[PDB]
Every structure is written in structure tokens, then in C-alpha cells.
Design an enzyme around this catalytic site. Structure first.
Site, PDB file in Angstrom:
ATOM      1  N   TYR A  54      17.068  19.055  24.933  1.00 46.54           N
ATOM      2  CA  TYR A  54      17.740  18.218  25.918  1.00 46.54           C
ATOM      3  C   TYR A  54      17.034  16.867  25.963  1.00 46.54           C
ATOM      4  O   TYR A  54      15.843  16.797  26.283  1.00 46.54           O
ATOM      5  CB  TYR A  54      17.721  18.884  27.292  1.00 46.54           C
ATOM      6  CG  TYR A  54      19.067  19.382  27.769  1.00 46.54           C
ATOM      7  CD1 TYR A  54      20.076  18.493  28.123  1.00 46.54           C
ATOM      8  CD2 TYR A  54      19.327  20.743  27.879  1.00 46.54           C
ATOM      9  CE1 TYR A  54      21.305  18.944  28.566  1.00 46.54           C
ATOM     10  CE2 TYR A  54      20.552  21.204  28.319  1.00 46.54           C
ATOM     11  CZ  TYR A  54      21.538  20.301  28.661  1.00 46.54           C
ATOM     12  OH  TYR A  54      22.760  20.757  29.100  1.00 46.54           O
ATOM     13  N   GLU A  56      18.424  13.764  27.540  1.00 50.01           N
ATOM     14  CA  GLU A  56      19.311  12.913  28.319  1.00 50.01           C
ATOM     15  C   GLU A  56      18.676  11.547  28.534  1.00 50.01           C
ATOM     16  O   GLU A  56      17.512  11.439  28.943  1.00 50.01           O
ATOM     17  CB  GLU A  56      19.638  13.579  29.657  1.00 50.01           C
ATOM     18  CG  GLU A  56      20.483  14.837  29.510  1.00 50.01           C
ATOM     19  CD  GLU A  56      20.511  15.681  30.769  1.00 50.01           C
ATOM     20  OE1 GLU A  56      21.614  15.895  31.315  1.00 50.01           O
ATOM     21  OE2 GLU A  56      19.433  16.132  31.211  1.00 50.01           O
ATOM     22  N   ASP A 209      39.272   0.748  15.873  1.00 47.17           N
ATOM     23  CA  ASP A 209      39.102   2.193  15.721  1.00 47.17           C
ATOM     24  C   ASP A 209      39.253   2.512  14.237  1.00 47.17           C
ATOM     25  O   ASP A 209      40.347   2.796  13.748  1.00 47.17           O
ATOM     26  CB  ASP A 209      40.109   2.950  16.577  1.00 47.17           C
ATOM     27  CG  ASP A 209      39.736   4.407  16.764  1.00 47.17           C
ATOM     28  OD1 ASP A 209      38.771   4.865  16.117  1.00 47.17           O
ATOM     29  OD2 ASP A 209      40.411   5.094  17.557  1.00 47.17           O
ATOM     30  N   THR A 235      34.792   7.880  14.092  1.00 47.13           N
ATOM     31  CA  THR A 235      34.223   9.197  13.894  1.00 47.13           C
ATOM     32  C   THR A 235      33.166   9.136  12.799  1.00 47.13           C
ATOM     33  O   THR A 235      32.969   8.110  12.141  1.00 47.13           O
ATOM     34  CB  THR A 235      35.306  10.202  13.516  1.00 47.13           C
ATOM     35  OG1 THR A 235      35.973   9.747  12.334  1.00 47.13           O
ATOM     36  CG2 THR A 235      36.313  10.346  14.638  1.00 47.13           C
ATOM     37  N   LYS A 238      36.116  12.325   8.787  1.00 49.52           N
ATOM     38  CA  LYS A 238      37.229  11.640   8.069  1.00 49.52           C
ATOM     39  C   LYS A 238      36.755  11.233   6.667  1.00 49.52           C
ATOM     40  O   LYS A 238      36.540  12.138   5.841  1.00 49.52           O
ATOM     41  CB  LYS A 238      37.746  10.426   8.850  1.00 49.52           C
ATOM     42  CG  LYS A 238      38.835  10.694   9.885  1.00 49.52           C
ATOM     43  CD  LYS A 238      38.341  11.362  11.161  1.00 49.52           C
ATOM     44  CE  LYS A 238      38.975  10.791  12.419  1.00 49.52           C
ATOM     45  NZ  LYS A 238      40.276  11.397  12.697  1.00 49.52           N
ATOM     46  N   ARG A 244      30.944  16.312  12.474  1.00 54.90           N
ATOM     47  CA  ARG A 244      31.868  15.868  13.511  1.00 54.90           C
ATOM     48  C   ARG A 244      31.082  15.261  14.666  1.00 54.90           C
ATOM     49  O   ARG A 244      30.329  15.956  15.353  1.00 54.90           O
ATOM     50  CB  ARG A 244      32.742  17.029  13.973  1.00 54.90           C
ATOM     51  CG  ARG A 244      33.760  17.433  12.926  1.00 54.90           C
ATOM     52  CD  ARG A 244      34.675  18.549  13.386  1.00 54.90           C
ATOM     53  NE  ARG A 244      35.637  18.879  12.340  1.00 54.90           N
ATOM     54  CZ  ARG A 244      36.762  18.206  12.122  1.00 54.90           C
ATOM     55  NH1 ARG A 244      37.075  17.168  12.885  1.00 54.90           N
ATOM     56  NH2 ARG A 244      37.575  18.571  11.141  1.00 54.90           N
TER      57      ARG A 244
HETATM   58  N1  LIG Z   1      19.177  17.897  40.360  1.00 55.77           N
HETATM   59  C1  LIG Z   1      19.450  17.453  39.005  1.00 55.77           C
HETATM   60  N2  LIG Z   1      18.472  17.465  38.114  1.00 55.77           N
HETATM   61  C2  LIG Z   1      18.701  17.056  36.841  1.00 55.77           C
HETATM   62  C3  LIG Z   1      17.891  16.947  35.673  1.00 55.77           C
HETATM   63  C4  LIG Z   1      18.709  16.456  34.661  1.00 55.77           C
HETATM   64  N3  LIG Z   1      19.919  16.277  35.166  1.00 55.77           N
HETATM   65  C5  LIG Z   1      21.057  15.776  34.415  1.00 55.77           C
HETATM   66  C6  LIG Z   1      20.828  14.324  33.998  1.00 55.77           C
HETATM   67  C7  LIG Z   1      20.741  13.388  35.203  1.00 55.77           C
HETATM   68  C8  LIG Z   1      20.627  11.928  34.769  1.00 55.77           C
HETATM   69  C9  LIG Z   1      20.720  10.954  35.942  1.00 55.77           C
HETATM   70  C10 LIG Z   1      20.779  11.372  37.280  1.00 55.77           C
HETATM   71  S1  LIG Z   1      20.865   9.970  38.218  1.00 55.77           S
HETATM   72  C11 LIG Z   1      20.833   8.820  36.982  1.00 55.77           C
HETATM   73  C12 LIG Z   1      20.880   7.304  37.158  1.00 55.77           C
HETATM   74  O1  LIG Z   1      21.618   6.839  37.957  1.00 55.77           O
HETATM   75  N4  LIG Z   1      20.017   6.462  36.340  1.00 55.77           N
HETATM   76  C13 LIG Z   1      19.990   5.007  36.441  1.00 55.77           C
HETATM   77  C14 LIG Z   1      21.329   4.409  36.013  1.00 55.77           C
HETATM   78  C15 LIG Z   1      21.166   3.340  34.932  1.00 55.77           C
HETATM   79  C16 LIG Z   1      20.897   3.942  33.553  1.00 55.77           C
HETATM   80  O2  LIG Z   1      20.838   5.331  33.388  1.00 55.77           O
HETATM   81  O3  LIG Z   1      20.832   3.111  32.431  1.00 55.77           O
HETATM   82  C17 LIG Z   1      19.655   4.556  37.863  1.00 55.77           C
HETATM   83  O4  LIG Z   1      20.697   4.343  38.771  1.00 55.77           O
HETATM   84  O5  LIG Z   1      18.417   3.944  38.105  1.00 55.77           O
HETATM   85  C18 LIG Z   1      20.747   9.532  35.773  1.00 55.77           C
HETATM   86  F1  LIG Z   1      20.698   8.925  34.553  1.00 55.77           F
HETATM   87  C19 LIG Z   1      19.956  16.630  36.479  1.00 55.77           C
HETATM   88  C20 LIG Z   1      20.973  16.637  37.478  1.00 55.77           C
HETATM   89  O6  LIG Z   1      22.279  16.217  37.197  1.00 55.77           O
HETATM   90  N5  LIG Z   1      20.676  17.049  38.702  1.00 55.77           N
HETATM   91  C1  LIG Z   2      25.691  22.645  36.289  1.00 56.82           C
HETATM   92  C2  LIG Z   2      25.580  21.814  35.039  1.00 56.82           C
HETATM   93  N1  LIG Z   2      26.685  21.311  34.428  1.00 56.82           N
HETATM   94  C3  LIG Z   2      26.634  20.561  33.308  1.00 56.82           C
HETATM   95  C4  LIG Z   2      25.429  20.246  32.680  1.00 56.82           C
HETATM   96  C5  LIG Z   2      25.328  19.398  31.436  1.00 56.82           C
HETATM   97  O1  LIG Z   2      26.341  19.651  30.472  1.00 56.82           O
HETATM   98  P1  LIG Z   2      26.080  19.061  28.997  1.00 56.82           P
HETATM   99  O2  LIG Z   2      26.009  20.269  28.095  1.00 56.82           O
HETATM  100  O3  LIG Z   2      27.265  18.157  28.757  1.00 56.82           O
HETATM  101  O4  LIG Z   2      24.774  18.318  29.154  1.00 56.82           O
HETATM  102  C6  LIG Z   2      24.158  20.721  33.260  1.00 56.82           C
HETATM  103  C7  LIG Z   2      22.847  20.388  32.588  1.00 56.82           C
HETATM  104  N2  LIG Z   2      22.240  19.186  33.116  1.00 56.82           N
HETATM  105  C8  LIG Z   2      20.890  18.872  32.692  1.00 56.82           C
HETATM  106  C9  LIG Z   2      19.865  19.771  33.347  1.00 56.82           C
HETATM  107  O5  LIG Z   2      20.228  20.530  34.275  1.00 56.82           O
HETATM  108  O6  LIG Z   2      18.682  19.718  32.943  1.00 56.82           O
HETATM  109  C10 LIG Z   2      24.235  21.547  34.480  1.00 56.82           C
HETATM  110  O7  LIG Z   2      23.117  22.036  35.076  1.00 56.82           O
HETATM  111  C1  LIG Z   3      40.714  11.380  13.898  1.00 53.74           C
HETATM  112  C2  LIG Z   3      40.699  10.201  14.763  1.00 53.74           C
HETATM  113  C3  LIG Z   3      40.362  10.317  16.120  1.00 53.74           C
HETATM  114  C4  LIG Z   3      40.029  11.643  16.746  1.00 53.74           C
HETATM  115  O1  LIG Z   3      38.637  12.020  16.511  1.00 53.74           O
HETATM  116  P1  LIG Z   3      38.045  13.385  17.134  1.00 53.74           P
HETATM  117  O2  LIG Z   3      36.699  13.590  16.466  1.00 53.74           O
HETATM  118  O3  LIG Z   3      39.048  14.465  16.778  1.00 53.74           O
HETATM  119  O4  LIG Z   3      37.931  13.151  18.630  1.00 53.74           O
HETATM  120  C5  LIG Z   3      40.365   9.182  16.881  1.00 53.74           C
HETATM  121  N1  LIG Z   3      40.664   7.959  16.396  1.00 53.74           N
HETATM  122  C6  LIG Z   3      40.982   7.817  15.111  1.00 53.74           C
HETATM  123  C7  LIG Z   3      41.310   6.455  14.594  1.00 53.74           C
HETATM  124  C8  LIG Z   3      41.004   8.925  14.255  1.00 53.74           C
HETATM  125  O5  LIG Z   3      41.337   8.723  12.959  1.00 53.74           O
END
Ligand SMILES: Nc1nc2ccn(CCCCc3csc(C(=O)N[C@@H](CCC(=O)O)C(=O)O)c3F)c2c(=O)[nH]1
Ligand SMILES: Cc1ncc(COP(=O)(O)O)c(CNCC(=O)O)c1O
Ligand SMILES: *Cc1c(COP(=O)(O)O)cnc(C)c1O
Ligand SMILES: Nc1nc2ccn(CCCCc3csc(C(=O)N[C@@H](CCC(=O)O)C(=O)O)c3F)c2c(=O)[nH]1
Lengths: 451, 455
Positions: A54, A56, A209, A235, A238, A244
Site C-alpha cells: 500500500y 497511497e 486519448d 492505456t 492496446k 492493463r
Molecule cells: N481513518 C483512515 N485511515 C487511513 C489510512 C489510510 N487511509 C486511506 C488514505 C487516506 C489519504 C488521505 C486522507 S485525507 C487526505 C488529504 O486530504 N491530503 C491532503 C490533500 C492534498 C494532497 O493529497 O495532495 C491534505 O488536505 O493536506 C488524504 F490524502 C485512511 C482512511 O481513509 N481513513
Molecule cells: C473501508 C475501505 N474501503 C476502501 C479502501 C481502499 O480501496 P482501494 O483498494 O481502492 O485502496 C480501504 C483501504 N484504505 C487504506 C487503509 O485503510 O489503509 C478501506 O479501509
Molecule cells: C480501450 C480504450 C479505452 C478503455 O480502456 P480501459 O482500460 O478498458 O478502461 C479508453 N479510451 C480509448 C481511446 C481506448 O482505446
């Protein structure tokens, strides 16, 4: 249980399905313009331990620690993304986190527009993609048409090209904030000069695109839209022959006081991808993309792509020299828009019969009144080191199918049943397919041998 | 060029990077509650030839042809998804094409709500997720807050638990069309029955985002949100221990003789495709199916039971060393450590632990609104490496040393950047960090690791 057991030992039901698909790809002829065959080097990274990370955020600005290595992998994928299309790191940035093509487009709209802002993209039955803002006359299909207001610009049914004048006419009546210059079924090349002039006039954003033509654009065979578009999305499969995933290229740096007016794309584009739309990046797909991106910088990929256009042009003429009309009169990219009903049959009919003889193509609406043509794709078989003589046997194989097609009813369900139920026709079925499979298997196949 | 050349020969620079990350996961104490180590079987499918096939649509209803094999794979992934969570196919359906967890939630909102319809989830600093509708006092952050109107519900700062009373109070005023019962940083079990009563009163959909606890739910070691929720979304990684993908479970069938029917299936499936996503990632779908098969075995139940024991052992161990826990402890896979009673913030403790190969993340506590004063610690990752209760008590001891190191450096430093830069440029503390890091990496390397051996 250790988590290190092989797939063939632990899940034999899934392993057989992997081999059934690996055999189906080997035995058939792939002519869907959007599909290819990924290299084994990229698949090894696609199924790596990077799935367990992870990360993020972005390199430098990540939400937590432990991203020592995936930061370098993301930055390397960024470096390789600008190289593959020759871009100055001071004029262009890249975001390698989009999950696919559709997420990359919605990320651009979220970044640069407000909800219900106006969008202009080529209509879907005229060769545009869903994510270009397609809604029918009964429903809003793509979410790009729900969260944003989209009006399509159509094809000129004469030239089969983009009606670059009807676009400029409506672009001042519609006043869009962004116009998408990209296609999913279009043999000619986009006049990005007209698209930018229309955009710069009605003061809209030019989004390219280039998903279908990204490989060709990387090999410097066709004109690169990076000279006109502020935002370029694509993408990674293609024609790019990668895993992908998706990418978002954006202008960076400086676009009457004497003070530089800077580009404001980077921070918005990155913020729309995370934390607005997506969560944890797919680092395995990110590394696999960097692998295929490095392969695009090589002279081999240019020789490969130059072969795709030759394979598409030689296929086009081989279609032509049998009595086939081509929408736009020919091809200048990687796929041919065959106009089929001048020969007496449509697309939905041809595509089923070809599928039953291990030939994969898609029906595509041609300028006309059931779709009236096919979208045949070179880049898939070209990656199997196909050549002009090989595609000529492909079109002769396709065309034994269409000649069955003209001989195979009234409705489409009858057309369907008559293919497999007609015993005398069912034996010509196994005939044509067996020689298509016999001819296809002899060519090499990228990726693993087993799966 | 054959396309069958190995990665070690084709791209040595990328191959070296894959091995460096592999060594980092092997040598480190991975405590991120959202991370896990995927099995080799699923990783073989994730990087397979299924990446080559475009199968836009659904089994049976495909936009192209030749999808005969990937139709069987997608149909198998659905059956295993329903069996993993003990779901009646006549009462539950499932969509297996979401690219990740965030796309799964956005698809549910797009399927069920009109633009700007109202959403209620747990606030992010209180333990909710971004995709539950988070927006700050100054900016709309998640797209959940832009395309839809969200208002969060909060914890009870006294108990550290979800304030179901204030939720019911505000839900009647806000009138949400959908409420999300799911968390990203919450050590307790969610009262899905009480969530259902609130949703039934204000006539709202109950979405259960069980991403962090999906593995625990499948092994039947904690109560199932499927008993009370209309829609259940989850990631396929984390406690499910699969590749990165998403899932959308939904009710189907029947909800003056007028039996009202469930109308989730067609709306959910349309939102995923053609609305939001393009071609399915069939390689990820197969990897998910492999992991879902693993989740039905007695082994996975023993793994989930061990995750609960390890989390409670880590919680009990932290309490012994004089630490505070939000909500007083844990009932699931993670533990919320409150560091304020010991004098260090979660931002400083995160960087110190990262430099000794202990990966965690800072976490806001009930109180600040401010640099986070807490830390989130997870059990699923190391438990997959066959960690047991005594191993986690040892994991706490390494954590306790890092905290004591962070305390000493704060007393010699000023701002946060002066703190981080001190651990890298002060030899006395750097030398003491290298000794704890080496002592941690030796302990971690000895444990087995799922996946391939070298990448
Ligand atoms: N409890 C809880 N714990 C965790 C741990 C991981 N996650 C998921 C990832 C959270 C990321 C995230 C949350 S707030 C924020 C944000 O506004 N950041 C900048 C905006 C500008 C910038 O990102 O360029 C800010 O405003 O300063 C974020 F980026 C979670 C979660 O969802 N909940
Ligand atoms: C409830 C919930 N839903 C969605 C996501 C994130 O989905 P993606 O697979 O698209 O990241 C998280 C993980 N969030 C980060 C964390 O909890 O550490 C989560 O805790
Ligand atoms: C194939 C294609 C998409 C769709 O891409 P996905 O990976 O299926 O989301 C979007 N735009 C163009 C121009 C494409 O050729
Ligand atoms: N030119 C061009 N060619 C191709 C080839 C493949 N693609 C990408 C995939 C397009 C898929 C798609 C577009 S419209 C539509 C649709 O309305 N489908 C149901 C709606 C009800 C339901 O889904 O049940 C219907 O009304 O029948 C679709 F499913 C393209 C492309 O984008 N452009």
C-alpha cells in the site's frame, strides 16, 4: 499452508482455465484492434510482491512509510513514460497510477472540470469511446455523461473522416470546457491541428486519448498529439503491448504583466487520481508498465510498430483487391474500418462466424443505417511476428468466412443457429477453423508458455 | 524479440528493484493493518495471459467474442465469492470486476444514487474511509464528496465507539439516501443491526464496506454484515489475502400480495460497465478467485482466528507496557494505540519505526482535530508469516524501544522536520537505530513469506 505453493498444485481448477485461455489465444487469430499479447517480462512484474504494498500518495508525499522501493519504481515508470514519447521533463509530467483507460479519463474530467461542465467527444457509433461522454437517446451510458454534460461531434458520412467543420460550428454554440481528440474505431489520423484551433478558439481544453495508437505514437510512425494537446491520456495495453493500466500526460511549467502564466494541470490531475478517485496504487501494474515502456524505447518496438502499419496497410489493400470498401478509403494507423454491406452483409453477422473459426473481431457501426462493418486489428498478430504475406492469408481466411457469411436466414438468431445447427454447414465449420488453428499455432506467442 | 524473455534478462534495473522490495517485505515487521502477503498461486494468475483478453461486458452478454474461457473464470469467481461468505445465490449476487475498493464504492453510489444525493459515513479522522464521503472544512477531497453530498457521523470520544445515538439523530435531519457501515481504523465490531434500524427509519440503503474485515467475515470469526446490509463492498486484498481488486455484493430476489423485488443487480452491474470501467482485468479476477477458494478452507479459518488472537495479544502487550488504546482494546484484526499519555505523537513514532523496519501509520485519536497522537497497528500481515501470540509480544518490545528512541530525540529537537532530519544526521541516535533495525530484521527474516522467493 505457506503461500508458496504453485497454482497448478493448489488450485488445479483455475490452472486448467489458465491453460484453456493460453491455448485459445495461441490457436486463434486476434484481430480486435484493442488487444495484444503482453511480454513475459511485464507479466513477471504484474504478478510480483509489489501487490503487497500500500503506497497511497506520490513519491515524496506518501501517506505512510515503507515506500523506499516503490517510490523509485513509480519515479522510474515516470521517467520511462516521458522517454517512450520523447517529452521534456520541464514541459510534461506523467501520472502512472490510473487503474485503466476509463479511470484515467474520469480523473482528467474531475481534475480540470466541475460537475456538469461541458464535454465534447466523438460519438461512439462514429468511432469514439464510452468515456468520451456517450449517452444514447434513452439513457446516459458512460458515467462521463452523468457527472458531466457531453455533446458528441459526428463523422462526415461522405469522407468517413471527422467533420472538423461541424465540430468548430457547434463548439462555439456548445461552449465546452474540454474536447477529447481520440478514437476507438477510426482508420485515419486525427487532425490535431484542427482540434487545437477549435479548442483554442472556444477556449476549451484539448485532451488527446491516444490509447489505441499509443504504440504507434511512441515509435514515431504517426504524428504525435503531444504537440497540440495539453492533456494526453492512454492505456498501457492496446498497441503499447503492456499490462492493463492507464496514464495521464499533462503540460507542465509555463504556458501582459511580464509574469509567467504557469500551467495548472499537475496538482489538479494528481489530486483527482488520489485522494479523489482511487485508493492504493497497483504497484505491480505500475512496474509492469515501466517494463513495457522501456521496450517501447527500443529500436525493436519501432520495427514492430512500422510492421503494424504495413500489416494494417497490406491488410487494407488485400481487403480492397477483393472488392471491399474501407471507411475513409484506407488506413493510416493499426486497424481497418471495413465497410461490409457494399459486399452484401453487416458486422454483427460476420463477427459471429469468424469467432467460431477462432478469428476474433468486433462489429463496428459504419456511416449508414445492425452495424455495417468490422474493426480488424493488426497489432495483436503483428506481435507474433506476422508479416504482409501472413495477413494476406488472414484476410483470405476472414474472407472465406464472409463468403460463408453471405451463404449462411432472415433474422440474427436464425443466422446464429444456422451456423452450428445446420449439420452440413457445421462440418464446414470445423473445416475452416482447423486450418485457421493449424496456421495460427505455428507463429510464436509472447509471454509464458504455460499460462 | 520473442516476448518470452525473462524479466531478469530483459530489464535488470526493474528486476533489481523487484528484489529490493522483496527483501524489504522479508526483513521488515509489516504492521500496516490494510496490508497482507498474497500467495504465489494468486500471483501466478495475476501475471498471466488473461491480461491479453478484452472481455467488456459480462458472462453471456459480451461486447465481443472469444471470451468463452474468461466467462468460465468470471462465473467461477462469483460462485467462490458467494461460497466464501456463505451466501445464497438466490438471495445474493456479486460483481467481481471493480478494479479496486474505491472503484467499487463509487460504482455503488453511481448505481443507486443520483448526482448530489446524500451520503453518511464515518468521518475519516474518526476511522472512516475516503470513499465514505470525506471532505474537510476547506476542500472537497474524495470524489464521494464532489459527485454526491456527504455528511459524516462521529465517534463517542468518551468510549471511542461509533455514536449510534447521534447518527440516528443526524440521519433524521440530514435524510441520507445511503449510509455506509464500514471502517478503515476501528478496533471494534460494527453494530450492523443498529445501523439497519437507522437506515430502515430514514429509508436509506445500508452499505457495508467490510474491506478491512472481509477475511474475518468469510472465516465466520466475527459477525457478518451480510445479515443486515443491502450492499456489501470489499477489497480483495487485506484480510482476504488476494490480489488488489474489488467486489460488490448485493441483495437479489424478493425484498395485497405485492412482494416488492430487489432492484440492485441491473443497476450495480450497469454502473461498473459501461458507466465507469472499461475492460475487466481478467488476470486480477482469476487471482481473486484463487484467494476466494483459499478463504473457504479450514486453514483460512485458523488463520483468521490467529489474527484475532495476535491482535488481542498485541493489545494486551501494549497495555502492559503502559499504553492507551482507543475503545480500550480490540475485537478484530487491528489495534488503535493512543500515544499521547506517553509523550510522543504518531507522526514522530511512524518515522522512527520506519527506520527500524517496522511499518505502521499515524492515526488520529478521539480528541485532537493537529498532528496525530496515535498509531494504527495490524495483525493480518505478520500472521500470514506464521507469527503467533508470543511473536507479537516480541513485536511490541521492538515497538517500545522505537518509542523510547523517539522520546529521546524529541527532547533534543524542535519542529517535526528537525526531528526527522535528526535521526539521519546524528550519529549517536543513528547508531542506536541501526542496532534496533538489525535486531528487528534478523527477527523478521526468520519467518516464512508467501509469494515467490525472489520477487
Ligand atoms: N481513518 C483512515 N485511515 C487511513 C489510512 C489510510 N487511509 C486511506 C488514505 C487516506 C489519504 C488521505 C486522507 S485525507 C487526505 C488529504 O486530504 N491530503 C491532503 C490533500 C492534498 C494532497 O493529497 O495532495 C491534505 O488536505 O493536506 C488524504 F490524502 C485512511 C482512511 O481513509 N481513513
Ligand atoms: C473501508 C475501505 N474501503 C476502501 C479502501 C481502499 O480501496 P482501494 O483498494 O481502492 O485502496 C480501504 C483501504 N484504505 C487504506 C487503509 O485503510 O489503509 C478501506 O479501509
Ligand atoms: C480501450 C480504450 C479505452 C478503455 O480502456 P480501459 O482500460 O478498458 O478502461 C479508453 N479510451 C480509448 C481511446 C481506448 O482505446
Ligand atoms: N466505436 C467504438 N467501438 C467499440 C468497441 C468496444 N468499445 C468499448 C466498449 C463499448 C461498450 C458499449 C458502448 S454503448 C453500450 C450500451 O449501450 N450497452 C447496452 C446498455 C444496457 C446494458 O449494458 O445492459 C445496450 O443499450 O445494448 C455498450 F455496452 C467501443 C467503443 O467505445 N467505441
Amino acid at each position: 499452508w505457506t503461500g508458496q505453493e504453485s497454482l497448478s498444485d493448489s488450485d488445479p481448477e483455475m490452472w486448467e482455465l489458465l491453460q484453456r485461455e493460453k491455448d485459445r489465444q495461441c490457436r486463434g487469430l486476434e484481430l480486435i484492434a484493442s488487444e495484444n499479447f503482453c511480454s513475459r517480462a511485464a507479466l513477471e512484474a504484474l504478478g510480483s510482491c509489489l501487490n503487497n504494498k500500500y503506497s497511497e500518495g506520490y513519491p515524496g508525499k506518501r501517506y505512510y512509510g515503507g515506500a523506499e522501493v516503490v517510490d523509485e519504481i513509480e519515479l522510474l515508470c515516470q521517467r520511462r513514460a516521458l522517454e517512450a514519447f520523447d517529452l521534456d521533463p520541464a514541459q510534461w509530467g506523467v501520472n502512472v497510477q490510473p487503474y485503466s483507460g476509463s479511470p484515467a479519463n474520469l480523473a482528467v474530467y474531475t481534475a480540470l472540470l466541475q460537475p456538469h461542465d461541458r464535454i465534447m467527444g466523438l460519438d461512439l457509433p462514429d468511432g469514439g469511446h464510452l468515456t468520451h461522454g456517450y449517452m444514447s437517446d434513452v439513457k446516459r451510458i458512460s458515467a462521463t455523461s452523468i457527472f458531466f454534460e457531453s455533446m458528441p461531434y459526428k463523422l462526415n458520412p461522405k469522407t468517413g473522416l471527422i467533420d472538423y467543420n461541424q465540430l468548430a460550428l457547434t463548439a462555439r454554440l456548445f461552449r465546452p470546457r474540454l474536447i477529447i481528440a481520440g478514437t476507438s474505431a477510426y482508420a485515419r489520423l486525427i487532425d490535431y491541428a484542427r482540434m487545437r484551433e477549435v479548442c483554442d478558439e472556444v477556449k476549451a481544453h484539448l485532451l488527446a486519448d491516444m490509447a489505441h495508437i499509443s504504440g504507434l505514437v511512441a515509435a514515431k510512425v504517426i504524428p504525435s498529439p503531444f504537440k497540440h494537446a495539453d492533456i494526453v491520456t492512454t492505456t498501457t495495453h492496446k498497441t503499447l503491448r503492456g499490462a492493463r493500466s492507464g496514464l495521464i500526460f499533462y503540460r507542465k511549467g509555463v504556458k501582459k504583466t511580464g509574469r509567467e502564466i504557469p500551467y495548472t494541470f499537475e496538482d489538479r490531475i494528481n489530486f483527482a487520481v488520489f485522494p479523489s478517485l482511487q485508493g492504493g496504487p497497483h504497484n505491480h501494474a505500475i512496474a509492469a508498465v515501466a517494463v513495457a515502456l522501456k521496450q517501447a524505447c527500443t529500436p525493436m518496438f519501432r520495427e514492430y510498430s512500422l510492421q503494424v502499419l504495413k500489416n494494417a496497410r497490406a491488410m487494407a489493400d488485400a481487403l480492397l483487391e477483393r472488392g471491399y470498401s474501407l471507411v475513409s478509403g484506407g488506413t493510416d494507423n493499426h486497424l481497418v474500418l471495413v465497410d461490409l454491406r457494399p459486399k452484401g452483409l453487416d458486422g454483427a453477422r460476420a463477427e459471429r462466424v469468424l469467432e467460431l473459426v477462432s478469428i476474433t473481431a468486433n462489429k463496428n457501426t459504419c456511416p449508414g443505417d445492425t452495424p455495417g462493418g468490422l474493426r480488424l486489428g493488426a497489432p495483436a498478430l503483428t506481435s507474433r511476428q506476422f508479416r504482409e504475406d501472413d495477413f494476406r492469408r488472414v484476410v483470405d481466411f476472414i474472407d472465406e468466412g464472409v463468403n460463408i457469411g453471405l451463404e449462411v436466414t432472415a433474422k440474427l438468431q436464425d443466422f446464429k443457429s444456422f451456423l452450428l445447427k445446420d449439420s452440413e454447414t457445421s462440418q464446414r465449420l470445423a473445416n475452416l477453423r482447423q486450418r485457421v488453428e493449424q496456421f495460427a499455432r505455428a507463429f510464436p506467442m509472447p509471454g509464458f508458455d504455460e499460462h
